[PDB]
Design a protein around this ligand. Structure first.
Ligand SMILES: [Cl-]
Ligand SMILES: [Cl-]
Ligand SMILES: [Cl-]
Length: 129
């Protein structure tokens, strides 16, 4: 599913991501924009052989199981395929664990490089929330 901008903001809020660990909704929408362009089915293969999955490009080295990432963990206790669903529940619950891991949203390098320090509120501007 490719979400609309405000549609995704609303879904993220419904699932308790708004201001989670102090990160406003615009931060999460911005991260999703640059990680996946709002496409739940986004996948990308990393140089280390791990893969990133879903709207927030969650990585199989630590967070989910895909059966093809040697020496990896599955800390969210989910198949990576769950992160591709039109229902963002699994991605949100896993993101909550990731952002609580110590480095906040810096875990998403694209958030650090493209969202951090910017006017992230623009991502939810106009949205009925
Ligand atoms: Cl915001
Ligand atoms: Cl594996
Ligand atoms: Cl980047």
């Amino acid at each position: 599913k490719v979400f609309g901008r405000c549609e995704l903001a609303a879904a993220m809020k419904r699932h308790g991501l708004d201001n989670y660990r102090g990160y406003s909704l615009g931060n999460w929408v911005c991260a999703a924009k640059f990680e996946s362009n709002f496409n739940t089915q986004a996948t990308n293969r990393n140089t280390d052989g791990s893969t990133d999955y879903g709207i927030l490009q969650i990585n199989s080295r630590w967070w989910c199981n895909d059966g093809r990432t040697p020496g990896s963990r599955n800390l969210c206790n989910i198949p990576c395929s769950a992160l591709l669903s039109s229902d963002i529940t699994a991605s949100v619950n896993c993101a909550k664990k990731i952002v609580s891991d110590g480095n906040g949203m810096n875990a998403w390098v694209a958030w650090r490089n493209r969202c951090k320090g910017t006017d992230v509120q623009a991502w939810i501007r106009g949205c009925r929330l």
